[PDB]
């Protein structure tokens, strides 16, 4: 129905157009590191 997913990119763009930041920040449970997904 829609066609990182396309809906998430659309939402983050629409929200950052109003000075609002979003991040996914998938945390790995093995090595304990934070990976931002864009």
């Amino acid at each position: 129905k829609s066609d990182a997913p396309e809906s998430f990119r659309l939402l983050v763009r629409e929200l950052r157009s109003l000075a609002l930041e979003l991040n996914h920040f998938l945390v790995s449970e093995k090595n304990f590191q934070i990976n931002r997904k864009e």
């Binding site: 829609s2 990182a4 997913p5 396309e6 809906s7 998430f8 939402l11 929200l15 609002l20 930041e21």
Partner: protein
Amino acid sequence: NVFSPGELIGLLRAERMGRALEEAICYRVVLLGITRASLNTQSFISEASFQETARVLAKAALRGRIDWLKGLKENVVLGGVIPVGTGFKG
């Protein structure tokens, strides 16, 4: 320094803090509503941004809330696999 005069805390958390802390903590049971209880949740993406969509985002961006995707509609709006049924691992 633990709690503010105006707060909505869980019942079990309040009882355990009363059994733990000796400082005077006074709480009265509040009967929430269908709409009011949904506006106070641990997530702001879906369960909070459905009715107002204006202040639920403002206060969240002001506090810098970190939302853990432990719900259904949160992952629906995100686009990933819903942790229900075949998606629920473990």
